[model samples]
Target: HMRQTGSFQPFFLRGKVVHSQLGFPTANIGLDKDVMECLQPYKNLVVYGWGTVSQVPGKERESFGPYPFAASIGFNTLTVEPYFLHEFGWDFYGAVVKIIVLGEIRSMGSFHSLQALVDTIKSDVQFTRDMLQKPQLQEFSRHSLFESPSSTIPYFEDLP
Candidate 1:
């Protein structure tokens, strides 16, 4: 295991949606090798973030989300391609995506079997949903980035 580098910090990330697997709706944000380093030292972990996908083909630019995002930053041996778990009604292929990582819940790790991994993922989603219900956490979902795609600053000026 590697040392955890970044503490709970708010930062914005922009990437395109890549193909996803694992049974749930997930979008593998494509980051180049160097770009990945900006958020590196991400081992086995469940990080929470607010996310939104930019304009899709025919759909109106709906600032559609700041949906509760639960992602395993298991960037090491366990999880090959670290991905974010969230649901979106439309396809985001070729769309620009922006996300603000709020905080991480726990460390990531390996599983004994594929079924075990699946079970853990289900629980991760549930844990993310439950945690996002808090007012403090819910506030992030209101960030201006979702409402106004051009806005750079987040909704809150301060957070712990």
Candidate 2:
């Protein structure tokens, strides 16, 4: 039997690039009551990639890289701006982004100092980098659903 330990909540996560007093640039996604409710089950999730990953044609482009990111699903907002690990070059703003959050890394909390926060974020990024290597989780991205050339959403009820 295949049981999912974590849930995949797909939604349009939109945010803006804002000032970072904590050293690393952070994109804070303001979450509404409903959005927060959807994310209630998730915390300490990695942003994965902060760009589009669909077949639709538009100005929004996928991050186009396997960069690992750390996101903190918190009380008020979400933070996913930890200088995406192994990032090359891609600006993500003014575009709707879809990110797959595998699971939580840790609980969200406040840091005594800015350095402490930065250190934790670095550790989170490293953790995600290592997590990405696992074959099981990697399958999520390599799934045929994403590779299929068809842009139409499949009807799962008819599928066995």
Candidate 3:
């Protein structure tokens, strides 16, 4: 069930730094009350998708990308962490990010060691890369959501 798709503002949260250490830094988004309610059905799952970052302070108004991404939704907490498959030299805290989840890769789980978690994430990244290359999925990379930087339409909505 790949119904989740929306835009959101990233927020600050101190992570363990393990993901960045493993070369997969993530943009963590806070799950406010409304967002939590919207995402309740997909609790504790890892999903793959296309995403765009826009409205970054001090940067051009242009959106960054409709890049391939792997995101975890409420794996162990009330947050959405998206690991964009691109090397963004700068961070985008408070930036608007739009995401359309295409499918689920796996259900979230706890790993005994950091190494185990790293290994699984590596596999997930590769899978996302290959999956997003499909012609149909690639088309979504150009969706209207990625174009506007200040669209006041609802930040979260079901794909029509």
Residue range 1-160, candidate 3, lDDT tens digits:
3333443222212111122376654557655566566777666888887887766767756667778888888844567778888998877777767778776778887799888888998989998888788897787787765554444422455554
Once superposed on the true structure, which residue ranges of model 3 sit more than 4 Å away at CA? 1-26, 75-77, 148-154
Predict model 1's lDDT versus the native: 0.59
Q: Which candidate has the top score in TM-score?
A: 3
Whole-model lDDT values for every prediction: 0.59, 0.46, 0.67
Top candidate when judged by lDDT against the true structure: 3
Residue-wise lDDT of candidate 1 within 11-91, one digit each (tens)?
666666666365654546666665555556545667766777666656645545656676665553223232445445457
On residues 1-160, what C-alpha lDDT tens digit does candidate 2 reach at each position?
Answer: 0123444443324333333553545555434455555655555544442232332235444334333455656543533433446444444543323345555566666679878977887777676766776876665554343233432221111111
Which TM-score value belongs to model 3? 0.76
Q: How does candidate 2 score on lDDT? A: 0.46
Candidate 2 lands at a TM-score of 0.58
Separately for all candidates shown, the number of backbone clashes (residues 3 or more apart, or on different chains) is 3, 0, 0
What's the candidate order when arranged by decreasing TM-score?
Answer: 3, 1, 2
